[PDB]
Amino acid sequence: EYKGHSGHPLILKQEGEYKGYSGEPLILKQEGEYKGYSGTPLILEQKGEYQSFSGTPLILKQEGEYRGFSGAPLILKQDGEYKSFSGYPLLLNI
Amino acid sequence: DDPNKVWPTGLTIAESEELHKHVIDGTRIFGAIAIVAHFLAYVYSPWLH
Amino acid sequence: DDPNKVWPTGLTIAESEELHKHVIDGTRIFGAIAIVAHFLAYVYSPWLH
Amino acid sequence: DDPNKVWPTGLTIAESEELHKHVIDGTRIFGAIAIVAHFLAYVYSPWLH
Amino acid sequence: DDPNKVWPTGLTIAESEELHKHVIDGTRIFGAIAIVAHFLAYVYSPWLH
Amino acid sequence: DDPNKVWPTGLTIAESEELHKHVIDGTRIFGAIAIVAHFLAYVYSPWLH
Amino acid sequence: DDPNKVWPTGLTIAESEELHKHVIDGTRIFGAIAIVAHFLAYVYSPWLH
Amino acid sequence: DDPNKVWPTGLTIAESEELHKHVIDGTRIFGAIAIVAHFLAYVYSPWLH
Amino acid sequence: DDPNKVWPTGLTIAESEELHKHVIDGTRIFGAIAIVAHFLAYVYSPWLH
Amino acid sequence: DDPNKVWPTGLTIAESEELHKHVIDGTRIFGAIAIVAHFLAYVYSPWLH
Amino acid sequence: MNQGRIWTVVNPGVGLPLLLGSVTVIAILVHYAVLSNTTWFPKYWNGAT
Amino acid sequence: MNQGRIWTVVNPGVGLPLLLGSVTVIAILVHYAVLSNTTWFPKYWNGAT
Amino acid sequence: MNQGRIWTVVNPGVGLPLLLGSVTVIAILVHYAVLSNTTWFPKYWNGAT
Amino acid sequence: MNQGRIWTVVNPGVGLPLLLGSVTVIAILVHYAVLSNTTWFPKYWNGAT
Amino acid sequence: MNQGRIWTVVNPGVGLPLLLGSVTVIAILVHYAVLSNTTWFPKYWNGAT
Amino acid sequence: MNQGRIWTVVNPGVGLPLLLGSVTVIAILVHYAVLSNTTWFPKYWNGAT
Amino acid sequence: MNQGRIWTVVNPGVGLPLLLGSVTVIAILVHYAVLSNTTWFPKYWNGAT
Amino acid sequence: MNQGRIWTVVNPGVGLPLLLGSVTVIAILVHYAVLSNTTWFPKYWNGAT
Amino acid sequence: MNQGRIWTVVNPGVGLPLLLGSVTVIAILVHYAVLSNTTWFPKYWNGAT
Ligand code: BCL
Ligand code: BCL
Ligand code: BCL
Ligand code: BCL
Ligand code: BCL
Ligand code: BCL
Ligand SMILES: CC(C)=CCC/C(C)=C/C=C/C(C)=C/C=C/C(C)=C/C=C/C=C(C)/C=C/C=C(C)/C=C/C=C(\C)CCCC(C)(C)O
Ligand SMILES: CC(C)=CCC/C(C)=C/C=C/C(C)=C/C=C/C(C)=C/C=C/C=C(C)/C=C/C=C(C)/C=C/C=C(\C)CCCC(C)(C)O
Ligand SMILES: CC(C)=CCC/C(C)=C/C=C/C(C)=C/C=C/C(C)=C/C=C/C=C(C)/C=C/C=C(C)/C=C/C=C(\C)CCCC(C)(C)O
Ligand SMILES: CC(C)=CCC/C(C)=C/C=C/C(C)=C/C=C/C(C)=C/C=C/C=C(C)/C=C/C=C(C)/C=C/C=C(\C)CCCC(C)(C)O
Ligand SMILES: CC(C)=CCC/C(C)=C/C=C/C(C)=C/C=C/C(C)=C/C=C/C=C(C)/C=C/C=C(C)/C=C/C=C(\C)CCCC(C)(C)O
């Protein structure tokens, strides 16, 4: 075992429950549901759809393709090789 | 397509949209409190006066 | 739906809600101490005087 | 080629293109608001005057 | 519930509570030393004089 | 050698080259806009005057 | 309890306690050198004079 | 030795040396441009004058 | 105990102690050079004069 | 011991020592250039004059 | 409100802490900005002259 | 109080340290702000004139 | 609008937070720049003289 | 004292280093604050005039 | 245009965000540099006296 | 001396580098503090007038 | 030109971004240094008086 | 000389870079400190008046 | 020249980038130090008055 230079003991043994140097109790047990100190209720239960507080609707449902709000088209279709916008060639393949 | 498809985040489309409802509602509530804070600042600070 | 569903964090809905009770209670207790600290600051500092 | 090929990100080509529609639309909306903000700044600030 | 349930951190409820006893005792010991340090600071510094 | 060899990034040589076409084209487009921006700066700022 | 239990860090209780002996001895050795350093500082610097 | 040995990075010796050809040639290209930039700086700035 | 036990770092006790011989000897080499550097600094700088 | 033993880094002793030859030779090359740079600095700057 | 599917590609465990964190950081930055560039905000804390 | 399900998508091992850490950082920032922008807070620590 | 396939090689969970984050950081930097280098923006917050 | 179960969802290998680290950082910050905003603390180190 | 194979050894999910990010950061740094070292750029924002 | 079991939940490969690293950083911070807030410490290095 | 085998032990996905990134950062630092320590570089941007 | 077993719980691939790195950083910090708080060190570099 | 076995416990993919990076950073720091604490180095760049 380690033989320190700063004398002995180097650690304190423990054969059971931790004993607090600052007295007891150290923690509070719980028999079940959390008993809050700031009264009750602590949370609001949700039985189904999320009940908003800032009115409704909260989201816009999407059917099919994305309906762009800034007109159309939103993307340029690519067929085959990439269509360069800065002319050609774009590579010097080995 | 399949609405039951689990996406890389683990959420389905329906679960992602349900989650976003909290984000939209949270944004709207944050905005409402910010609106009142801006009104109080206008009434008591020299801003816009 | 299924209340037994283990979500990506490993917590069930019931476990997540029970955890949040500590977060709400901690926020309320933090607020109460902050309220007293603001009262002491008002009584002893020149703020709002 | 194969349009059903799942790429390393998990998205297909069609899914990546559909996702990019939101990025392009979001950029256009951000630009529109920025254009109005720049107009207001010009009308009220001494910039460009 | 089950007291033998290993939670995501690997600790059981009993192990987490036993660990917290060291955290509470450590906080109380840190507080006691801080209280003496504040008393010495008051006695020797011009604070609160 | 083998043109079908999937490299550690998951891309083949043909896929890496096709990707680089966007980087080269993107660099050329950024350069074109930067050239115009430098022309405007010269016309309106005192730089090089 | 079980003294043979390998904890999440891989160390047993006996191994963790044996390791801590080095930490306590190291702290005590650091403290002794720091005490001499403070004595030298007091003897040669104007602190506490 | 074995020229076919895949090293921890996934590259063989022949592949690592082929890659380094781009780094060496790239360094030479950067050096050539930097030499011209230093020549322009000498011709137009007061450095070394 | 077992002297052949591979610890979590992958090194055995004998391998860890053999490694530390380089750290101790390296520290002694660094210390010797630092002592010479301090002697030169004292001889040439106004420190301790 | 075993010279064929693959260590946690994946390199054998023979491979690690062969690699270190580049580090030692590289350090000597860096040192040689630095010695010339210090000679130029002494010849042209007012340091040590 | 149409971006609800973002949580299918952005992990909530990442995007929600980043959102709430960023919003909080932005608010702190606006407070520090108005505090540093106005006289009435610091005077408000200074209170009674 | 209705956000209790956030812990099903945000891992408590991440969100709780971030929350408690952020709240502590915010408190430090507010103390530093009032200390730097007021005369009575530094004077309070300075005590006797 | 032709870069839509970027999400096949850049993960949206990384690129989207970086995009929205960078755009927000750039906006903050532009506000701080105009605020620090102009007199009319800080005076706007200062309001009534 | 009722939060003992936090270690079931927050990993002690993370939360304990963060707690002890943060407490130490806070103490350093308070020392730097009082040192910078008071005359008696620096004068204490300066000692004899 | 000859470096197209870089994406076989550099992951696009890493190199593309770093490329686009670095290019953006460099642009911001150049704007801040010209803004700090010139009188006409800040005067441009200040506009009408 | 009673906290010896901390190494069962905090990995020594992390906590020991953090402990020794933090202690070293704190010592550096205390040296910089006394150096900046005292005249005798810099004068000690300046030595002969 | 003899270090070509470095890519067998250093991953190109890491070493190439670090190389290109570091070279770019060094160039920026040299520009800021000459800009801050010379009068002709800022005057060059300021142009016509 | 008795801590040789530290490498059984601290990974040399981490602790050796941290040790050598920290020692190097400390040396830099001590050089910067003496350079900033003394007149003879900068005068040594300035050399001839 | 006797530390050649360090690459058996320190990964070259980590130690080589850190070594080359640190040497470069140290060189930059020494340049900035001599530039800030001497008159002849900035005058060298400023050249002709
Ligand atoms: C020689 C200095 C050694 C040392 C050597 C010894 C010896 C020898 C013994 C102990 C013993 C004890 N030590 Mg020890 N110990 C030191 C540091 C410490 C520190 C600390 C600095 O925080 C603590 C709390 C302890 C704790 C203790 C107890 C566990 C135990 C009984 C009480 C006691 O104080 O006995 C008396 C202790 C002392 C008189 C020394 C206390 C340390 C002093 C304050 C350090 C100042 C510097 C010193 C004079 C010179 C050394 C300078 C070098 C640069 C390091 N040691 C240093 C590292 N320690 C005793 C025991 O019970 O062992 C079975 C015992 O016989
Ligand atoms: C000597 C200084 C020790 C200490 C030694 C003891 C002892 C001894 C005892 C307690 C006991 C208690 N301690 Mg303790 N304790 C300290 C620090 C603390 C701190 C803190 C600083 O924040 C707190 C909140 C506590 C909390 C508590 C309670 C759980 C309990 C008191 C119940 C009661 O009504 O008793 C009514 C009163 C009594 C029974 C006797 C008086 C005990 C008083 C109340 C202890 C007050 C400590 C004070 C807050 C800190 C002083 C620090 C000094 C300035 C250095 N300890 C430090 C580390 N503590 C008691 C208990 O119930 O144990 C079973 C007890 O006997
Ligand atoms: C002693 C201080 C305790 C506290 C102890 C209690 C107690 C005791 C009770 C509640 C109850 C309630 N508390 Mg609580 N609570 C505190 C902090 C808070 C804070 C906060 C600071 O942000 C909030 C929002 C809440 C929220 C609530 C509601 C869920 C509930 C109804 C309150 C109400 O006005 O009912 C309408 C009014 C009344 C019922 C009576 C008058 C108000 C009572 C006394 C509670 C006022 C707490 C007040 C906000 C604390 C401010 C800080 C202190 C002044 C220092 N608590 C702190 C930590 N709380 C009550 C409840 O419904 O439980 C079932 C209750 O009985
Ligand atoms: C009390 C303050 C609450 C709030 C409570 C309500 C209520 C109550 C209602 C809505 C309703 C709506 N809310 Mg809300 N809402 C708030 C914050 C917001 C914010 C925001 C601040 O950014 C937005 C964009 C919205 C969005 C909306 C729309 C979906 C809808 C109004 C259009 C419509 O079809 O009306 C159709 C209905 C009407 C025209 C009736 C009158 C609604 C009036 C005009 C209030 C609208 C909300 C207003 C913007 C809130 C400002 C709060 C500030 C503190 C001043 N809410 C805050 C958090 N909201 C309405 C709805 O459709 O619910 C089904 C509704 O009745
Ligand atoms: C109301 C403000 C909305 C908007 C609503 C619409 C509507 C409505 C339409 C488009 C249409 C178009 N929009 Mg949009 N759009 C906005 C923002 C943008 C921005 C941007 C700010 O960067 C861009 C680049 C675009 C891009 C485009 C093209 C894809 C398309 C025009 C094709 C063409 O040749 O038309 C040639 C010209 C015409 C067909 C008619 C004249 C132009 C029309 C009115 C669109 C001008 C939008 C302008 C660029 C941005 C105005 C911003 C505000 C001043 C704040 N939109 C904002 C978010 N957009 C059009 C389209 O093709 O949809 C199918 C269309 O009808
Ligand atoms: C309109 C602005 C577009 C553009 C549109 C075109 C068009 C249109 C053409 C090219 C062609 C070429 N482009 Mg391009 N190109 C731009 C930006 C660039 C940049 C850059 C800024 O760094 C570079 C290096 C290139 C590179 C090239 C070459 C590969 C090729 C000319 C070789 C040749 O045969 O010449 C001799 C060729 C000609 C005389 C035909 C016309 C060449 C045009 C005028 C070249 C313009 C390039 C110039 C740098 C653009 C500057 C920016 C503007 C000031 C806005 N482009 C921007 C994004 N490019 C040509 C091609 O593909 O050839 C097969 C071609 O037809
Ligand atoms: C500092 C000084 C003085 C000077 C410096 C000056 C200077 C340099 C300034 C530079 C400024 C620059 C460069 C500005 C650039 C701004 C840009 C580019 C803005 C872009 C905005 C983009 C947005 C808003 C994107 C929203 C995306 C969205 C919402 C995406 C949604 C995705 C979903 C829903 C997933 C769908 C999944 C499934 C397909 C399965 O359904
Ligand atoms: C500070 C002071 C005073 C002085 C300092 C001065 C100083 C040093 C300045 C230095 C400046 C420098 C160095 C500037 C350099 C600028 C550069 C290099 C710009 C490059 C722009 C590149 C772009 C725009 C790339 C777009 C890529 C794109 C869009 C890629 C798209 C990819 C896709 C779609 C995937 C396809 C997948 C599949 C193939 C399967 O389809
Ligand atoms: C701050 C003050 C005041 C003072 C400080 C002063 C000071 C100290 C300054 C120091 C400056 C220094 C040190 C400068 C050093 C500069 C250097 C070294 C530049 C190097 C440039 C290298 C390049 C451009 C490499 C390109 C590589 C490339 C393109 C690689 C391509 C690879 C591919 C395509 C993969 C192939 C895959 C497959 C094999 C399968 O084909
Ligand atoms: C800036 C200005 C002007 C002003 C700033 C103002 C301002 C905001 C100040 C804020 C200050 C704050 C908030 C201070 C908070 C201080 C606190 C909370 C201190 C806490 C100390 C905790 C300790 C010491 C814990 C020791 C744990 C220990 C030793 C744990 C041991 C565990 C073990 C052995 C494992 C066992 C496992 C098994 C049982 C299974 O075996
Ligand atoms: C800023 C201003 C103005 C003021 C700031 C004021 C301020 C706040 C100051 C605060 C100061 C503080 C708090 C100082 C704290 C100092 C402390 C705590 C020092 C601790 C030293 C610890 C040491 C040396 C540990 C050595 C461990 C060792 C060698 C471990 C060895 C382990 C081994 C061999 C593994 C064996 C494994 C197996 C046995 C299984 O084989």
Numbering used by the authors:
A (entry chain S): 4 to 97
B (entry chain P), C (entry chain N), D (entry chain R), E (entry chain L), F (entry chain B), G (entry chain J), ...: 3 to 51
K (entry chain O), L (entry chain M), M (entry chain Q), N (entry chain K), O (entry chain A), P (entry chain I), ...: 1 to 49
The article reads:
Only the pucBAc gene pair is unable to produce a functional LH complex, so we could purify four different LH2 complexes that will be referred as PucA-LH2, PucB-LH2, PucD-LH2, and PucE-LH2 from this point onward. The absorption spectra of the three other Rps. palustris LH2 complexes are essentially the same and have two strong near-IR absorption peaks at 804 and 856 nm, corresponding to the well-known B800 and B850 BChl a Qy bands. SDS-PAGE also shows that the α-polypeptide of PucB-LH2 is slightly larger than those in other complexes, consistent with its predicted sequence, and that there is a faint lower–molecular weight form of this α-polypeptide possibly arising from partial posttranslational processing. We examined this point further for the α-polypeptide with the longest C-terminal domain, which is from PucB-LH2. We used AlphaFold 2 (34) to calculate a model for the α- and β-apoproteins in the PucB-LH2, which shows that the 17 untraced C-terminal residues of this α-polypeptide form a unstructured membrane-extrinsic domain. The likely lack of a fixed conformation would account for its absence from the density map. The B850 pairs in PucA-LH2, PucB-LH2, and PucE-LH2 from Rps. palustris have H-bond patterns similar to that in the LH2 from Rbl. acidophilus 10050. On the basis that the B800 Qy absorption band of PucA-LH2 (also, PucB-LH2 and PucE-LH2) is higher, relative to the B850 band, than that of a standard B800 to B850 LH2 complex, it is reasonable to propose that these γ-bound BChls increase the 800-nm absorption of the complex.
